[PDB]
Write a protein that binds this ligand. Structure first.
Ligand SMILES: [Cl-]
Ligand SMILES: [Zn+2]
Ligand SMILES: [Zn+2]
Ligand SMILES: [Zn+2]
Ligand SMILES: [Zn+2]
Lengths: 342, 331
């Protein structure tokens, strides 16, 4: 379109991102720090960030990768069945760890096998004002992959919300109308993040006319009817919904394989992609709340005091971008993005 | 353990052999024990004329007791005259509708000609509308396209190829004597979780797409019933490993290396090995109006490992059960 019209808003933040580690960190930190004031750095490195010491060391590597001078990373811990209440208390005391992430687990991955095992941890989190971030999916063999989110809401999340009414809980990267309704009907202590990719795409983009693993992510892209509920939620501006990309890069070779890794890469153009959704819905006025106000307000952190400018201008995205010594295929590779943000 | 079952020699009523350099590999796999195979026409270019079908048949036989049966690829330009010429050859028994055909209405004169000469209509039953979810495309096709055709051509034999849903099973069971369907080995053994849980697996990616486990269970019930409306059609559809494992991977799973052996595992697990013969060797020829095979094959319960890859012309193909065991042999 290239109308070259402008919108100035408060500088945004990203409340859910995977930066990985090591050689790729200069590339991922470059992308995330371009315009964000802050980002919430997810803990599922190898090994996972299960302690305060690990979180602070990882934070130092991020800062060493040379972010923009306006950028502050915020860290999260990875919860396990062995996590003690004491580690929660130490982490919050550091001032740089603001949340802990619950990844469900069954040879099965590390994580929490039973919510009951971490009740003392959740109590400690409630007490210190640490947020619980939840990847809301069960891992039961009997449950179909597209039903895992809905099953989680009923069996796991509802009991937790019922038991911890003063615990701030973010349902990360919601993908279903079931989760939208859950969050809307839960109390003031429940909120959710919405990715750019679950707003722009549905499962047909991954599977029609060929299989496209660069659209493969967890939780999985759902039906178009679920996508439409997410768009309505995000563009309402409601205080319960805020920006969290779940940008999750892997090397091209690990994506395009007999068994390809889960994760879509949107950090190269995240706010620009969100702007297209909000513009298409005729709701650009609500973008600032979603991107810059709702998350900090829910986390209890100050809003950014600087502004960014969104310009309606199309630009082509490269087929691939550097990713350490390898490459990553970004969302909209070989196509145009319709806004620029600086 | 080393138990034996002798049945009538089977046939495969839906196979993609491709063409050219890979043909020695694909024909080796399909001719191992099959009396006949129905050869699908979606080569490049597609087999749209009688002359193309007969030439292709000659190349298959040249690649080396197996009799290929040919099908035409329908298009909006297909004339009723080409149908008549193809059936007259004696070696083209069917025509395939790939939704290709932009509108079913455009080929009504073709379908009339097919009805008249006793050529079977094979249908890849999926709409391509952008608005329709990929898992709903089969069901949508049954309602919008197939049912009107069945209504308008009551003496046309129609095979709904590679059915994947309980919706299609019910449709076929409730349609008349002129409607039947093929069922693949992979839609019996797997569901969409095998393709998507713990990583994305493009060697399980095929069209029509693997569906929920509840749909898989309806297919197993259909196939193992031995009902005359359901017969063996692998839809074995090999592509090079590099075209599968890519930014946009091709649809198609490869089962021709062990197809009846894979079906035997399903039938054995369901305690219904006695119904394998009907599904594999009787129902298809009866529906096509062709004789049954007069030779027998022996199925032996003995496990063997499948290689990580097999040769596919100058490239390789990753087979179903690559790096795993198959539990039966058929010879
Ligand atoms: Cl607007
Ligand atoms: Zn997650
Ligand atoms: Zn994540
Ligand atoms: Zn087909
Ligand atoms: Zn086919």
């Amino acid at each position: 379109s290239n109308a070259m019209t402008t919108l100035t808003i408060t500088r945004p933040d990203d409340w859910h991102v995977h930066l990985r580690d090591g050689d790729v960190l200069a590339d991922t930190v470059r992308d995330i720090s371009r315009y964000n004031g802050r980002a919430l750095i997810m803990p599922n490195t190898v090994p996972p960030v299960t302690t305060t010491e690990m979180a602070l060391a990882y934070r130092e590597r991020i800062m060493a990768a040379q972010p923009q001078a306006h950028f502050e990373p915020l860290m999260a811990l990875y919860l396990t069945d062995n996590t003690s209440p004491e580690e929660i208390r130490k982490a919050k005391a550091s001032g740089k760890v603001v949340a802990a992430k619950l990844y469900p687990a069954g040879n099965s991955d590390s994580g929490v096998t039973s919510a009951k095992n971490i009740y003392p941890v959740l109590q400690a989190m409630q007490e210190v004002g640490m947020l619980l971030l939840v990847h809301g999916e069960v891992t039961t063999h009997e449950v179909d992959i597209f039903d895992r989110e809905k099953t989680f809401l009923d069996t796991v999340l509802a009991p937790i919300v019922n038991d911890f009414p003063q615990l701030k809980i973010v349902l990360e990267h919601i993908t279903t109308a079931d989760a939208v309704t859950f969050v809307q009907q839960a109390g003031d202590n429940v909120a959710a993040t919405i990715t750019a990719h679950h707003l722009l795409f549905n499962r047909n983009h991954m599977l029609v006319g060929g299989i496209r693993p660069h659209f493969y992510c967890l939780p999985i892209l759902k039906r178009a009817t679920h996508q439409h509920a997410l768009v309505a939620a995000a563009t309402s501006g409601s205080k319960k919904f805020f920006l969290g990309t779940d940008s999750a890069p892997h090397a091209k070779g690990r994506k395009e394989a007999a068994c390809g890794c889960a994760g879509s890469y949107t950090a190269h153009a995240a706010l620009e992609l969100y702007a297209e959704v909000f513009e298409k819905e005729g709701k650009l006025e609500n973008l600032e709340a979603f991107a810059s106000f709702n998350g900090p307000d829910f986390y209890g952190l100050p809003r950014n005091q600087e502004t960014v400018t969104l310009t309606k201008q199309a630009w082509p995205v490269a087929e691939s971008m550097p990713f350490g010594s390898d490459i990553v295929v970004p969302i909209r590779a070989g196509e145009n993005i319709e806004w620029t943000v600086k």
